[PDB]
Ligand binder design. Structure first.
Ligand SMILES: Nc1ncnc2c1ncn2[C@@H]1O[C@H](COP(=O)(O)OP(=O)(O)OP(=O)(O)O)[C@@H](O)[C@H]1O
Ligand SMILES: Nc1ncnc2c1ncn2[C@@H]1O[C@H](COP(=O)(O)OP(=O)(O)OP(=O)(O)O)[C@@H](O)[C@H]1O
Lengths: 115, 115
């Protein structure tokens, strides 16, 4: 798939075409929708530019155009070689979600008293 | 002038039309140029939205169009009543610049030892 976090960026209309069962389902869908811009923002923030403007300009662009953070330019990602494995992207998303969303169900935390 | 920090936002091409004498003049001009977006970003950030995207969308819009943070929409600022006094804006800018730019010239700081 496309590299630079653009693959997760191009999956946001597929959440925009989702009907939640109730309001908590809607909250979770919105959480994932806001999370889907995080890798591109982090890559752009490490490059010294404002990540939110970069992500908004990627969203306004065509589906083949992303941000090359080395050149600092908006390019064609397949033609520039900036590509990612599909397995890596889906593995990262699933492994992050399955544990973080269970961490956000907690109400009581029990620890040991430090000796 | 226009309210919401848009008055300072429209004075950035007037810094783009400036020729620095040397590179430190250039550094100071760039400092003021980046500072000129701060009030609009702060007003938008207090409204719970991303200030940088709001400022960029104000940049891309016409000269009469700014952001009503109260209603959260992009409107004609004069026709919607969001206006500022010119004296207040220039007073705030001059009073901030004259002291902050002198604070950024310091190399040694002498304080009293606390008793
Ligand atoms: N020139 C580039 N422009 C834009 N994005 C790029 C560029 N080169 C790599 N990337 C992106 O940066 C990310 C790679 O980051 P990095 O390899 O540091 O971390 P990772 O793959 O998440 O994890 P790990 O630290 O285990 O390697 C990928 O999303 C990749 O598509
Ligand atoms: N509805 C609005 N939409 C957008 N900007 C607005 C709106 N109402 C006011 N503003 C802007 O917000 C700013 C007013 O902020 P505020 O009055 O809290 O602080 P101030 O004038 O900088 O200082 P002080 O705290 O001394 O009053 C002005 O720039 C004004 O144009």
């Amino acid at each position: 798939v496309l590299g630079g976090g653009c693959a997760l960026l191009r999956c946001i209309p597929a959440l925009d075409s989702l009907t939640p069962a109730n309001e908590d389902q809607k909250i979770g869908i919105e959480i994932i929708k806001r999370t889907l811009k995080i890798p591109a923002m982090t890559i752009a923030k490490n490059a010294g530019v404002e990540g939110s403007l970069i992500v908004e300009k990627i969203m306004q662009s065509s589906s083949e155009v992303g941000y090359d953070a080395m050149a600092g330019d908006f390019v064609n990602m397949v033609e520039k070689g900036i590509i990612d494995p599909t397995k890596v992207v889906r593995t990262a998303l699933l492994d992050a979600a399955g544990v973080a969303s269970l961490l956000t169900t907690a109400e009581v935390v029990v620890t040991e008293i430090p000796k």
